[PDB]
Design a protein around this ligand. Sequence first.
Ligand SMILES: O=C(NO)c1sc2ccccc2c1Cl
Ligand SMILES: O=C(NO)c1sc2ccccc2c1Cl
Ligand SMILES: [K+]
Ligand SMILES: [K+]
Ligand SMILES: [Zn+2]
Length: 396
Amino acid sequence: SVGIVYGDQYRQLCCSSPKFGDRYALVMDLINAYKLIPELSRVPPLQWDSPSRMYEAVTAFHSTEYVDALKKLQMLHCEELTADDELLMDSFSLNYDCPGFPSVFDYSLAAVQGSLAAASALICRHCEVVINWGGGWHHAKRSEASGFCYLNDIVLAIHRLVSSTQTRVLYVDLDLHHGDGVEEAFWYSPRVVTFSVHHASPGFFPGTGTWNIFLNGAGRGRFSAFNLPLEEGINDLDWSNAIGPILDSLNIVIQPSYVVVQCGADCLATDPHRIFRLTNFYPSLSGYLYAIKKILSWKVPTLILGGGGYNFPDTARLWTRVTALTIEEVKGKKMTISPEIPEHSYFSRYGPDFELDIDYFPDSIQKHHRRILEQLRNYADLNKLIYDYDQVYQLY
Ligand SMILES: O=C(NO)c1sc2ccccc2c1Cl
Ligand SMILES: O=C(NO)c1sc2ccccc2c1Cl
Ligand SMILES: [K+]
Ligand SMILES: [K+]
Ligand SMILES: [Zn+2]
């Protein structure tokens, strides 16, 4: 039973931003064109009994003043801003990368509604895995919008998971960018282990998840925040070998109750960032599909979320394959996807070849592996977890 977050209103809201435009619609219509929808349990986004209940849910992480500012920003964009209102927005970074637009609050709230409903479906055991392609806004902070992330749906979903009972959550962030917002939220918590693989280089957004020595959490959360910064140009195989032993070692040591995976598609070779060279190939084998298949082999209730990805048809091509892989891994039912894009309302967006495969022809890691292994040992010692060092050592 694989769950997928969707709904008519949800679709309209996810498609209402100037940055992500109709991406979510392309993603969901491609999944539907590949006849995957009948295999999936629709997870309806969470709706609240009152404005107070909605505030209680969002303020489990964000400050009231920030939520008030975001709701006022939407109101203001539904009618220019005064000098005092511009100052107020600037105090929450609601500007530049995170501008206001008529549906800014509804749009960012929708991802939270989706990811909280997805966590609830895992908690009641209705779904083994839940997918939310409208979610994964990893950069949003308590009182600050960042990288087009206004509300952090991941933190709120993880917070719902961790507090459902000892519950431990493993958060794996596959996006090109460092998952700073999620890592910061759980910096002092040993029960949420964060691991982000990403590109890092001077002046590259958001700037964290790299050498500062490496910070890895604080207080009781020391050694609980893991990071693997990778150089530009990394391909499927090298990225797969870089993350594989880390994922496996985290699962053996942490023994998570839940896994939350952020699957931002900006690592694709065809993403306009043009930083990593990952594919959606399923014979080289896509780094994403290798990582997703590995996580699902653990048989731990999992939450799969979206994130980055500016090349909309290529993000759809990758997420359609992630979706089919999840059905296969959970149900044990073969999913056969035709290499040609099937006819549907968005067919023309996949041109000029109309194929499912993206249009692409293809010591530092060992040093990070040793650093990460030491951190995992340190985390295990601080948290009094029983583990076999040799079983973990041999994975690398
Ligand atoms: O509840 C389960 N088995 O009894 C399963 S099967 C499976 C496959 C992938 C991820 C989670 C999961 C769970 Cl939980
Ligand atoms: O895909 C993204 N993060 O995972 C990012 S980073 C960033 C920085 C400025 C503006 C947007 C943006 C997005 Cl989207
Ligand atoms: K990442
Ligand atoms: K942590
Ligand atoms: Zn990104």
